[PDB]
Ligand binder design. Structure first.
Ligand code: ADP
Ligand code: MG
Ligand code: MG
Ligand code: NA
Lengths: 9, 344
């Protein structure tokens, strides 16, 4: 897997 | 980490508002090197977004998404503030102010600046504060604890005001407290601005319950003293256990709620002194109200938080006339803080 606004969870 | 790099008086005549200038730190930005305030001429040098991995969501405001994260390079907790679509001018202003104030007393530390290589969504990376939500924390504070944390916020405001910056959004949600460590940080510099004497500012700042009367009557030539009204609204909510203290239904009702407590005599004196044009929407709703004694908000559950010194200090923050309010440094000298000062 997941990325959110480029950040990996 | 990521950083920015370089590349009163006459007034308008017989009508219009009387001009005002800050009583303190008036001309501090005029004499700075232009690089201190000229954030449009700077460019961001970005850090590595891959250093940070998300742990949990903290903030879902209208204008940011905030996550707790870990820096995988050094294993430290950070917070990431993902900026929702907003002026480029606005993000570089928040960055510039955070960099100018970095290392000052009780000012949150900006650690890095990164962006998504795909969407180009920028994010600010901060030191993490292990906050207790104010809706749980404030009702557990002792009398001393309120004095201590109010003094900590005043250190941050005297510092930022001395550096030429108005915060313009002082409220509980922008004050992080790690209560185990008595550690307080003033966060959220995204509405903060550089003070220039004579400048007319946007009154659509702060958050309704913490807005000073100058914002509510559309007096644009305001200054650092706006923050002092906001701090007085926080103090009242803490010592009277009434959150928020002035609970308006909208910006017009907000001023009515204030006037039902501080009375209309001093409000109409303020409007007259600065020749403020009061929005005709106030005709039906404001009316005329007596001033209430601060003593009427005291009851069995909050009396241990109230002292003569608390009520005198509150009275000297919650003044309509922005020029009449204590400055942050004058507030720090108030008898309410005499025990906090000796403890340092
Ligand atoms: N450094 C931090 N440590 C812990 N929580 C934080 C930190 N920075 C922000 N937060 C949380 O995220 C929320 C929003 O951050 P803030 O900078 O105030 O954004 P906005 O300008 O969108 O209000 C805060 O009210 C707080 O709950
Ligand atoms: Mg905020
Ligand atoms: Mg903000
Ligand atoms: Na004290």
């Amino acid at each position: 897997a997941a990325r959110l606004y480029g950040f990996k969870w | 980490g990521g950083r920015l790099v370089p590349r009163f008086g006459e007034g308008e005549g017989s009508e219009g508002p009387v001009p005002s200038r800050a009583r303190v730190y008036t001309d501090v930005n005029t004499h700075r090197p232009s690089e201190y305030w000229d954030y449009e001429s700077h460019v961001v040098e970005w850090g590595n977004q891959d250093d940070y991995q998300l742990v949990r969501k903290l903030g879902r405001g209208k204008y940011s998404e905030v996550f707790e994260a870990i820096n995988i390079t050094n294993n430290e907790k950070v917070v990431v503030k993902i900026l929702k679509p907003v002026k480029k001018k606005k993000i570089k202003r928040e960055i510039k102010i955070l960099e100018n104030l970095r290392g000052g007393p009780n000012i949150i530390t900006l650690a890095d600046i990164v962006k998504d290589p795909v969407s180009r969504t920028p994010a600010l990376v901060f030191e993490h504060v292990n906050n207790t939500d104010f809706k749980q924390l404030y009702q557990t504070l002792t009398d001393y604890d309120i004095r201590f944390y109010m003094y900590e916020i005043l250190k941050a405001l005297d510092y930022c005001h001395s550096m030429g910056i108005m915060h313009r959004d002082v409220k509980p949600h922008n004050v992080m407290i790690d209560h185990e460590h008595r550690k307080l940080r003033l966060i959220d510099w995204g509405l903060a601005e550089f003070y220039h004497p004579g400048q007319e500012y946007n009154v659509r700042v702060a958050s309704r319950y913490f807005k000073g009367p100058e914002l509510l009557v559309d007096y644009q030539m305001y200054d650092y003293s706006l923050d002092m009204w906001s701090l007085g609204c926080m103090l009242a909510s803490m010592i009277f256990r009434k959150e928020p203290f002035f609970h308006g239904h909208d910006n017009y009702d907000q001023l009515v709620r204030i006037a039902k407590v501080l009375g209309t005599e001093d409000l109409y004196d303020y409007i007259d002194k600065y020749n403020i044009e009061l929005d005709p929407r106030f005709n039906d709703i404001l009316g005329r109200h007596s001033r209430k004694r601060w003593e009427r908000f005291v009851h069995s559950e909050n009396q241990h938080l109230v002292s003569p010194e608390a009520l005198d200090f509150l009275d000297k923050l919650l003044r309509y006339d922005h020029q009449s309010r204590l400055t942050a440094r004058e507030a720090m000298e108030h008898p309410y803080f005499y025990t906090v000062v000796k403890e340092n």
